[PDB]
């Protein structure tokens, strides 16, 4: 939940709690929709594969259910708008947001105590950056030559 009231979509799963125990992001502190508030009596928190969040209480068998996580998918995630803070927004080319249980209807599964690294390959980025640097110097040679031609004409013609 963004401060303006809208909903932002994030692949970053580093969450935490605020003073009220609501499950919020570990950055700016935006609460997760729907709210998942951890009671103060909890001794261990488990999040299921299907997104079922439950806690364990002293002197009480069976995990006590506290909430249910839901995740959203898009037909074209490449059309999402990057807004910073590891957050996305839906756009016209992204497609309508489709929400559902995490594990049915083609949705992914929630992996507790596990984080998703960036898909950046520094090998590819550095190699491409060298190529782009060469192409950058290619167009400077054209501009340098054009400038010299105009200088030559200014002296001759």
């Amino acid at each position: 939940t963004l401060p303006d009231g809208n909903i932002g979509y994030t692949r970053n799963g580093q969450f935490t709690l605020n003073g009220e125990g609501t499950l919020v992001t570990s950055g700016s502190g935006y609460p997760v929709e729907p709210e998942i508030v951890i009671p103060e009596d909890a001794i261990s928190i488990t999040v299921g594969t299907d997104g079922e969040v439950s806690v364990r209480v002293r002197g009480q068998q069976d995990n006590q259910v506290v909430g249910q996580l839901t995740i959203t998918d898009f037909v074209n995630p490449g059309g999402l708008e990057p807004i910073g803070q590891n957050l996305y927004l839906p756009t016209g080319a992204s497609g309508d947001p489709q929400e559902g249980v995490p594990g049915l209807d083609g949705l992914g599964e929630i992996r507790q105590s596990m984080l998703e690294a960036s898909n950046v390959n520094v090998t590819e980025e550095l190699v491409n950056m060298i190529e782009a640097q060469r192409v950058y110097e290619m167009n400077s040679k054209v501009i340098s030559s054009v400038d010299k031609m105009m200088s030559f004409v200014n002296q001759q013609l």
Binding site: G19, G21, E81, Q133, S144
Partner: protein, 268 residues
């Protein structure tokens, strides 16, 4: 060049975070820190929206991972450790026990006044129980005093049971309950602001201090004769040292590239 500078600053922060974790590998009750990063994407009304290069990398927050660390056995009854969830309540001044801070290491001892104090000569806070009564009578924390003479009879041994109660036997063979160690909990441990000497204070982002006994409710047990080391992993920190260096080196190459572009135009 600021995107590459953001990469250097973000990577250099990870070195400083890891370096502090490695530096405190031996301090008792230490909790390791993790650096968390976020993207920067800024646009205005007059900025093209389809092509959106990022603004770089911004350090989101340095976390305070509070997972349980390994326990060391010293066979010293004044060495206390909380196994589970909870904190020791430690007050700087004896008269005012409201000005306290939360700590996890329990290297305690008695000063000349027989008050159980830490290595910084700060008073541990505990509950007051009548020697004949049972549970805590008044929940307001007070410094724990172990009188040398009770009766009379001189103090001989001190021990703590799993409920945190400090009991002393004396020369006259009388077993007297002197109180119990108070255990403090917060709903969000990540929100505690960090003071010096492995001590934290409650903040708005950590909630209000929750006072309770050990092995009661959501609290852990109190074990004497034990101390808890740092919760860092040497193998993990050394590997994180390796990966953070490879991202600062990669980013400096990008910063090197951007300068050579500007030098190229400056030679037309």
């Amino acid at each position: 060049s600021y995107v590459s500078l953001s990469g250097l600053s973000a990577a250099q922060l990870d070195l400083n975070t890891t370096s502090n974790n490695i530096a405190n590998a031996n301090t008792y009750g230490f909790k390791e820190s993790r650096a968390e990063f976020a993207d920067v994407y800024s646009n205005s009304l007059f900025t093209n929206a389809k092509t959106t290069p990022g603004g770089g990398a911004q350090a989101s927050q340095v976390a305070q991972q509070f997972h349980e660390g390994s326990s060391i056995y010293t066979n010293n009854p004044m060495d206390l450790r909380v196994s589970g969830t909870g904190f020791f309540a430690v007050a700087k001044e004896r008269l005012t026990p409201q000005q306290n801070e939360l700590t996890r290491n329990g290297a305690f001892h008695l000063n000349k006044e027989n008050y159980m104090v830490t290595a910084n000569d700060e008073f541990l806070l505990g509950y007051q129980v009548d020697p004949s009564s049972g549970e805590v009578s008044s929940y307001e924390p007070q410094p724990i005093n172990i009188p040398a003479e009770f009766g009379t009879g001189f103090l001989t041994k001190v021990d703590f049971d799993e409920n945190g109660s400090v009991m002393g036997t004396y020369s006259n063979g009388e077993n007297v309950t002197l109180g119990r160690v108070a255990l403090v909990r917060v709903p969000n441990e990540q929100g505690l602001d960090k003071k010096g000497g492995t001590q934290w204070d409650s903040t708005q982002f950590s909630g209000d201090k929750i006072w309770g006994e050990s092995n009661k409710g959501s609290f852990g047990t109190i074990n004497n004769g034990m101390l808890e080391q740092s919760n860092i992993d040497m193998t993990q920190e050394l590997v994180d040292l390796i990966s953070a260096q490879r991202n600062f080196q990669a980013n400096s190459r990008s910063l090197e590239v951007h300068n050579q572009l500007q030098q190229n135009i400056l030679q037309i």
